[PDB]
Design a binder for this molecule. Structure first.
Ligand SMILES: [Cl-]
Ligand SMILES: [Cl-]
Ligand SMILES: [Cl-]
Ligand SMILES: [Cu+2]
Ligand SMILES: [Cu+2]
Ligand SMILES: [Cu+2]
Ligand SMILES: [Cu+2]
Ligand SMILES: [Cu+2]
Ligand SMILES: [Cu+2]
Ligand SMILES: [Cu+2]
Ligand SMILES: [Cu+2]
Ligand SMILES: [Cu+2]
Ligand SMILES: [Cu+2]
Ligand SMILES: [Cu+2]
Ligand SMILES: [Cu+2]
Ligand SMILES: [Cu+2]
Ligand SMILES: [Cu+2]
Ligand SMILES: [Cu+2]
Ligand code: NA
Ligand code: NA
Ligand code: NA
Ligand code: NA
Ligand code: NA
Ligand code: NA
Lengths: 298, 298, 298
């Protein structure tokens, strides 16, 4: 795209603020930002806020979201589809033109771990170029295991293909499959989908802890066989809905866009890989690490 | 196949009639019929009754099916495998030769949304060329959410490959992935697996309704990440068995041959896409539309 | 690998013995063994004990496993990862060098049907070359349907690729997809992952029986759509955990490394195919047979 040559828009922080007991404002950008997806490999990603996947959004069950998208792309329209919400797609998930903003309002009625993404046609192109992310909707009544959880993180799986290549997007294997982590609390890591950061800077935990991961496989195209080496999931809530409660799973099958809340215990000090067990994808980048120490500090 | 050149057998209606409180007769054909699977692209499909996927069958839990296949193919044997039934495959799912009929009897003991397909070796070839469909077995005691449902439709996902090409069937990506709808009540659409009909003639609903979809991914080869844009599934019954009850799912993972009953609420007027969220497949055709109006009429 | 040329190490029996009410010893080898994966096609597999998948391990919930690996490979290190156990991967799943042994101890706290595999980097290479298997952990309180089961077997699904070809392992379709059975009781078959043995020598059962299969899809790369022709699964326990209880499923979606306990009734004499319903994989070998006779003998 001629108008994207040389464009590298600096990341912009997510803007969120609560405006009522059940109403929140969210503003994001659509912007074109260079991301190092593998060592020496830059992808000029189509992004929300200069991150791919985009910034984490967390709201409460029953919140109405007043969402603004500011399109900084000089030529391509962009939009927003939140899987969390009940909305009219043809009125509320519509395109925002270059250098314009649009505001859309809709409720998040359902607890869970939802994908969000750009919904501009061709949707495959917008997702594959980087316009994906997660919104967590916290259940009003919690999860039955909340009291047992010591530490929690968010992980997202995505693929990367040949740059802006619709033939490859439709017909080719992924070049990379990757994990990223998005921060829930101050001090948590906040990373983009790449083959290396969560290997070189593992997530941290303490011996004996029960860890919760909020996970989503945003695709665009693959399913995920999510597994933590050296443990078994004590409890799994499919899509993060507390009703969808499995126990003692080795591996959680996630569709494309599928989410889960998974919980597991780390019993011994060491480094614990986190994979998709589709090992072709793991080999192409989709391995993160959890470093478990006697203190929980590095 | 030399004997199929120029052959285009007109579709033949499904013949069904109840013959006892727990016994039904079903007659279908195997026939060779040209279907427009994408604009300008004719596939000389191997079919039941001149439809691909084939005609919808609906029976009640506990019905015994007395099934007749009339093979109109001039050269290829065909057969019938219903996933709904308990049967001896080597006695009851056997081949019917060209220009012959066979009758097979077996019970449908289990409620749900089942695949049916030709079972003639090589089964991949017969399924991929179009010999797939759905049989719904209605639960004797219903679903716990029956009273909440306002409107219901059937959707089926399938793939299409290069014509009768066993190398492609085994080793290649699908050329098209498609949805079709099969009629449950007079006035419902009844379509074949193509890339366009359910975009140009969306399914219809009314603002505020709870919609039930009976869905099955017949493959032959892919899994499906089934998602309705702008809503969340209130309730999901895996394989249509009332016991297998999930709530609040964004996306339902279907294996090849996998079924579900899914229910969701449409809260606002507009057009709602229905996808597999494996977006390579969506791009290759697997997007249907649901048009939601203030009246439920177009 | 030059040091593997001409190497064909004869299979070695699994060594297991109970050493306390909640402690068991297991010794396995890593060894290089020629396996006929399709007629006329030898794969010089990387194996545990000269089988691929490896030998079946069965323990009780709450057993601690004292595991020894004896590496007979002349040049490649190998290791062991049991999905059943809680362990430190970086201390307990570590490499054993050629011509050495290592012993590792860890508890199997969770009931189910778990994958095991070599964990040596690149893990994809070790799994794809044959270093995979199943460990069953029997639930202390059984399954609620135990009293109904008449006969049981273990089935494992795996893929085979071009020989030791990491490009193919990462980027190519499988050349073969296969089932094997591993013996639970004297007289049960014990086979390797090949395209033919369970067709030519079907598993045996008796008309009217309820059959339990302990199943796992070890991959390395594909998911599985597990289906028995001519029946419906009465009960399914995902990952073999008794809590994860589905009923009346036609087909069970298994992630890579995913397990299940599935139970079904065979109502009539005949031969019943067992497939992955991803029919490209079935065509490439993944069809086993269950022969149901009036006596249960051939
Ligand atoms: Cl692993
Ligand atoms: Cl979508
Ligand atoms: Cl089948
Ligand atoms: Cu309030
Ligand atoms: Cu506002
Ligand atoms: Cu966009
Ligand atoms: Cu979406
Ligand atoms: Cu704790
Ligand atoms: Cu009656
Ligand atoms: Cu009759
Ligand atoms: Cu046929
Ligand atoms: Cu089938
Ligand atoms: Cu209503
Ligand atoms: Cu004891
Ligand atoms: Cu010992
Ligand atoms: Cu190894
Ligand atoms: Cu593993
Ligand atoms: Cu019995
Ligand atoms: Na792929
Ligand atoms: Na792919
Ligand atoms: Na494919
Ligand atoms: Na495919
Ligand atoms: Na594949
Ligand atoms: Na593959």
């Amino acid at each position: 795209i001629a108008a994207h040559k040389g464009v590298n828009q600096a990341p912009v922080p997510l803007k969120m603020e609560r405006v009522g007991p059940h109403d929140v404002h969210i503003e994001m950008t659509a912007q074109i930002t260079d991301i190092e997806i593998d060592k020496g490999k830059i992808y000029k990603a189509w992004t929300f806020n200069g991150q791919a996947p985009g910034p984490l959004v967390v709201v409460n069950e029953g919140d109405t979201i007043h969402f603004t998208l500011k399109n900084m792309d000089p030529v391509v329209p962009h939009s927003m589809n939140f899987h969390a919400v009940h909305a009219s797609p043809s009125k509320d998930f519509i395109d925002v033109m270059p250098n314009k903003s649009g505001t859309f309002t809709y409720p998040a009625n359902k607890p869970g771990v939802f994908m969000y993404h750009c919904g501009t046609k061709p949707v495959l192109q917008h997702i594959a170029n980087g316009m994906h992310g997660v919104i967590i909707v916290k259940p009003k009544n919690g999860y039955p295991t909340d009291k047992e959880v010591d530490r929690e993180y968010v992980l997202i799986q995505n693929e990367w293909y040949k740059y802006n290549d619709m033939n490859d997007f439709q017909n080719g294997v992924p070049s990379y499959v990757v994990f990223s982590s998005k921060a829930l609390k101050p001090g948590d890591p906040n990373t983009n989908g790449d083959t290396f950061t969560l290997k070189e800077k593992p997530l941290l935990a303490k011996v004996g802890e029960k860890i919760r991961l909020y996970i989503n496989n945003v695709g665009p195209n693959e399913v995920s066989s999510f597994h933590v080496v050296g443990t078994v999931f004590d409890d799994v809530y499919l899509d993060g809905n507390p009703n969808n409660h499995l126990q003692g799973m080795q591996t959680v099958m996630l569709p494309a866009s599928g989410g889960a809340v998974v919980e597991f215990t780390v019993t011994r000090p060491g480094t614990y890989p986190i994979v998709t067990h589709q090992f072709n994808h793991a080999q192409k980048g989709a391995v993160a690490m959890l470093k478990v120490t006697e203190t929980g500090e590095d």
